[PDB]
From a paper:
We here present charges and bond properties of hydrogen in a sub-1.2 Å resolution structure of a protein complex, apoferritin, by single-particle cryo-EM. Indeed, imaging with the CFE beam or through the monochromator yielded single-particle reconstructions of the protein complex apoferritin, which is often used as the benchmark for single-particle analysis (SPA), at 1.25 Å and 1.22 Å resolutions. Hydrogen bonding, bond polarity, and charges in protein molecules play critical roles in the stabilization of protein structures, as well as affecting their functions such as enzymatic catalysis, electron transfer, and ligand binding. These effects can potentially be measured in Coulomb potentials using cryogenic electron microscopy (cryo-EM).
The cryo-EM map resolves separate densities for individual atoms, particularly in the core region of the protein complex, while side chains at the surface of the apoferritin spherical shell seem rather flexible with some residues showing multi-conformations. The weighted difference map reveals many densities corresponding to hydrogen atoms. The number of hydrogen atoms associated with the protein model is 905, which corresponds to ~70% of total possible hydrogen atoms, after picking the atoms at a density level of ≥2σ and selecting manually based on their riding positions (see “Methods”). In the protein core, most of the hydrogen atoms are identified for both the main chain and side chains. The amino- and oxo-termini in asparagine and glutamine can be clearly identified by the presence or absence of hydrogen densities. However, in the weighted difference map, there is only a small negative density at level ≤−4σ near the terminal oxygen atom of Gln 23 and no around Asn 25 but larger and more dispersed negative densities at the same level around the side chains of Asp 171 and Glu 17.
Residue numbers in the entry:
A (entry chain A), B (entry chain A), C (entry chain A), D (entry chain A), E (entry chain A), F (entry chain A): 5 to 176
Write the structure that this text describes.
Amino acid sequence: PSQVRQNYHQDAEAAINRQINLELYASYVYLSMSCYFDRDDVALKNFAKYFLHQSHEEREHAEKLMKLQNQRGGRIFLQDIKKPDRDDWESGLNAMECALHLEKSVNQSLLELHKLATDKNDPHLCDFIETYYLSEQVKSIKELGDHVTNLRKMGAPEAGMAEYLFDKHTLG
Amino acid sequence: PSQVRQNYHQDAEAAINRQINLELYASYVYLSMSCYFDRDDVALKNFAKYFLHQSHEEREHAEKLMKLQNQRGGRIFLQDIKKPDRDDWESGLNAMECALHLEKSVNQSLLELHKLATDKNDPHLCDFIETYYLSEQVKSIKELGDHVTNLRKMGAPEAGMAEYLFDKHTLG
Amino acid sequence: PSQVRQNYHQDAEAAINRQINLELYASYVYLSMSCYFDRDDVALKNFAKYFLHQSHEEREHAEKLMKLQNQRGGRIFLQDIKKPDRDDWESGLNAMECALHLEKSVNQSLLELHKLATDKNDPHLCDFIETYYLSEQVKSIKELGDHVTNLRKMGAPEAGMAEYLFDKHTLG
Amino acid sequence: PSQVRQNYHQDAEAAINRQINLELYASYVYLSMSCYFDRDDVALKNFAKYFLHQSHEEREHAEKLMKLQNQRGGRIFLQDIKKPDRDDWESGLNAMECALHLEKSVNQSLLELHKLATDKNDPHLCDFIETYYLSEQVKSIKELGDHVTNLRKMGAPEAGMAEYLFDKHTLG
Amino acid sequence: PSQVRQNYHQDAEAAINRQINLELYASYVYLSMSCYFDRDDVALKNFAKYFLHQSHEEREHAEKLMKLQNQRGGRIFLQDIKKPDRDDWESGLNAMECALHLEKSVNQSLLELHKLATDKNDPHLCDFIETYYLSEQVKSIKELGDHVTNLRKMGAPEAGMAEYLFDKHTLG
Amino acid sequence: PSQVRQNYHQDAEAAINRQINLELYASYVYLSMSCYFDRDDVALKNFAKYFLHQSHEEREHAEKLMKLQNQRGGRIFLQDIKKPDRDDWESGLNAMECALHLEKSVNQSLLELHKLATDKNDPHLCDFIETYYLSEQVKSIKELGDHVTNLRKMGAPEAGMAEYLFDKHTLG
Ligand code: NA
Ligand code: NA
Ligand code: NA
Ligand code: NA
Ligand code: NA
Ligand code: NA
């Protein structure tokens, strides 16, 4: 084992590698969404900026897990980053709804990771997940839920001004 | 076609999508290298920082191509980002040599993209590639070649102090 | 020939003179649009400001071509600047759509100029066009396409608040 | 009629449209002169700058008339901007003499516009012309007359140093 | 081949070496001219300063080509820098005329280099030449043409005050 | 003779012209060395910078002699600047050793020039040489000797880290 490794179960190391991939995947999904909103036929710059920021955030999340993996003496094993499920994200509302789904999926994975950490009596990993991931996820989910709610209430996407004005006032 | 599209051949659009993937792939390779140097049994923080910066740069390169694709009215089609060929990059020198190979490969792809742009009489794309990609690549290749040279001359990796001191003095 | 003239084909000189006229024409079209939005019965001040700025930009484009013509030892031959096709531009959306058409037309002329420059092996002129004109055009076309998209989505011009709010939020 | 229109005779509206065209024409003439002085075989940069500034000033004059037309509820009708009478302006002195002629012509048109405004009992228009146009014209005419005088006295254009030194000392 | 070399034809490498020599030669010619104007029997300090600056600029041009050669993995091969054709440059006008000839000659060489780069499908080199050399040359040629024009118009060199005053007002 | 010439022997004027050429030659040699260290397979940036600075210094030395020649009413006669003896300078140590040889050669020439000045009872020239050249040379020779010593002691060039570390610590 790594000279630093202590109380770091192989199952945790594997789960962290999986989580890294998921974070990178989420980054890629958000990048896809950002690019969609930059299309000339979509042209919602603040949706684009929002999702680009999310993409960058997810990359940071992945990098922080990579740092954790090395800190604990695990070994990072990267996997392909799968392309997002869609190229065309349909609408600001649909993208926000998909983002919410993605964030909940990531959260579910983090909760499973936390359960694993607890099961393996790895409090450092538990704490790491709780501290840096779970609160962030809850905040993200709430924010996306709020965005979805607002867009839906505003009549998006059928109401043409809804996404535009949400783009300006909420995302701008 | 997109309302903005003008003089943008489908072959160029496809080539740009391929280049986006290659840039994202290069980003991922450099991320892999960065993580390797952050291993406790490698522990070259400035190599890690160097490659992380390269990873971020490659992502920026990809994002700029995505912006180009949308600016020209092409449509971004993302593909899986393949995992890097290696998890273990062996040494600072070997990583720099692999980086040089990667950069030359990316450069070759950009040169092919430029040839395509010239062939399709797409001077905007030609100019974009020349302006933002080809000079950057040449600079990157030269810098990596310089690093490789220096590491080799210093006796890396067999000479234990070579990578350490290169990490401090060239990359620090 | 002019003492400075070198590698500057008469066909290029002529094409540049034509481009100057086209830029001045575009300036005039945008001035027409600006004035339209300043009508009391239209009263979209930020559309007016947008198009006035475009008018000024096009004049700058023309002046830069005039500077090029003299720099290369060609001789500027001015022609009448034709009045714009319309006095009444109908709506913010219609003006933006017409602007997009105009910009694409100007771009097409620049692409033809670039082809001529390449054909005459005039790399200075090629570079000048690429550097100062083609990227600007692509950006302009994309921006107008984005504006058109947004106005259309917002329901312009039938939806009374669309142009108003676009005027405030996008153009203000 | 326009909801704002009050005491604005159709003849005034027409005269203003004519004046707009004349100002734009004057702008174009001065642009032509500026370009001439930027020729490598003329190369009087401060003459070029002087006339370019005049061109910009005339454009501003036209824009201010357009603003007036809209303020009064008239409708701007643009016409072709005729090319200047000359491509080659011969000399700094000849250009200044032609500028003086042009300015006097513009002044004459403004005086006719003022007479029309007085005839139609349009004191706002009278005041506008007096305030923003007639004093400017007199100043411009005097300045050009002064320049012509000085250039003539200096021996322009036959005395080779005259235009050069006038360019440096009066226009620089 | 050099580890960095990619898409860099030997003919380009040779042409770059030739261009380096030509730039160094031009530097030397301008140094010769500068020294001439510093003679007590010529004593035009701003002509001297002008040409000295040009000499330094040409050296920078040569150094930038040397940097390019190394960046692309070519090898610099220096040749003798031939002495200038003249020790005595006769007059400010004659020097400016000779400078114009030299600049056009350098430009012609750069155009040939660009043609070679295009022929060898070396867009990096093409871009480098266009970006850093061809626009600079056109500007230089125009500036020298302007100087020649002005000196000729002022009556140089027979008119004793022409060079003196040009030295003060244009070059000072 | 020149109106300023006083106590300036033709032999001194000739010797100064020879010295100018030698300084320009030394400049060129150092430029050659600088370029060598910028090769990707050498890649010692601070050696490159060191020699480039020396090249610039030698050019300044030449220019100062040119100024002297004109100040004394001699006439500068330039000669070809011969290419350096080598394209490949082998190593940092070998370049420093060659630089030392070159500097000693230049010093020897300056000493001969001083002897000539003393022989011709030209104290201004003697003083000029002593003041601006001889102390500089001694300093340069000592500095290069120190560099050679250090590189030799460090085990250059066989000891791979020697040039690297000297580049960083002494030249950086
Ligand atoms: Na995340
Ligand atoms: Na890249
Ligand atoms: Na334009
Ligand atoms: Na006017
Ligand atoms: Na040059
Ligand atoms: Na020296």
